[PDB]
């Protein structure tokens, strides 16, 4: 997002964040106490349903703001209380790269997953469709990209992780969410429906 910077002035009717109806983010130059900043949550635990303000706003919990859910207990890795810090923590479901049951190379999940559960971060560079076109004109052995939306693309060619091998389908069982993660947009992969162990993962490359 576009950070605001209006020294010695609050984030009022003249602040571009307030005008564009967006929260001020980590890199905005307003006070830490800016009323237009995201308040975080005060959940008991989990943070993986619409009852969590962070989850509802497509944001991971912030260790400096989400002080009660377990987001600040960053040293813990087992049966974690906040289920909305996985991208930050580098946690993912166990995945297997193997020949696809359809064709080429595929991804198989090794843990059962519920509808809308987080699977893995999809690593890569978020680039504009203009930079994606520029790259596609001029290359590597094999490139890995998908469309996030009408303006942005994720290129996993230079900075990807295993999940980049998950095949395309117009009837996918996975989807991507562009999420706010400690001031940065990062891509999360979630189950579209409940998936059982051993199932091949697919997502729609046209849009997610
Ligand atoms: Zn502002
Ligand atoms: Zn701002
Ligand atoms: Zn502000
Ligand atoms: Zn929460
Ligand atoms: Zn939170
Ligand atoms: Zn949380």
Numbering used by the authors: 520 to 657, 660 to 729
Question: What did the article's authors report about this structure?
Answer:
Enhancer of zeste homolog 2 (EZH2) is the catalytic component of polycomb repressive complex 2 (PRC2), an epigenetic regulator of stem cell pluripotency, and expression of tissue-specific genes involved in cellular differentiation and developmental programs.. EZH2 carries out a key function of the PRC2 complex, namely the sequential mono-, di- and trimethylation of Lysine 27 of histone H3 (H3K27) within chromatin. EZH2 contains a C-terminal SET-domain, a conserved feature of histone lysine methyltransferases. The catalytic activity of EZH2 requires the presence of at least two other members of the PRC2 complex, namely embryonic ectoderm development (EED) and suppressor of zeste 12 (SUZ12).
We crystallized and solved the 2.0 Å structure of the C-terminus of EZH2 (residues 520-746). Clear electron density was observed for the CXC, SET, and I-SET domains, and the first 5 residues of the post-SET domain. However, the 17 C-terminal residues including most of the post-SET domain were not observed. The cofactor SAM, present in the crystallization buffer, was also absent from the structure. First, immediately N-terminal to the SET domain, a unique CXC domain, coordinated by 2 clusters of three zinc ions, differentiates EZH2 from other SET-domain PMT structures (no structural homolog of the CXC domains was found by the DALI server). Second, the conformation of the first five residues of the post-SET domain diverges drastically from previous structures of active SET-domain methyltransferases, and folds in a direction diametrically opposite to its expected position, where it would otherwise contribute to formation of the cofactor binding site. Importantly, within the crystal lattice, each CXC domain interacts with a neighboring protein partially occupying both the SAM binding site and the region in which the post-SET domain is expected to reside. Thus, the conformation observed in our structure is not compatible with SAM binding and therefore reflects an inactive enzyme. The EZH2 structure reveals the opposite conformational state that could have similar consequences: a shift in the I-SET domain brings it in close proximity (2.9 Å) to the first 5 residues of the post-SET domain, effectively eliminating the peptide binding groove and sealing the entrance of the substrate lysine channel. Superimposition of our EZH2 structure with that of another SET-domain methyltransferase, EHMT1/GLP, in complex with SAH and a dimethylated H3K9 peptide confirms previous homology models showing that Y641 is perfectly positioned to engage in a hydrogen-bond with the de-protonated ε-nitrogen of the substrate lysine, thereby restraining the rotational freedom of the di-methylated nitrogen atom, and disfavoring alignment of the lone pair with the scissile bond of the cofactor’s sulfonium group, necessary for the displacement of a third methyl group.
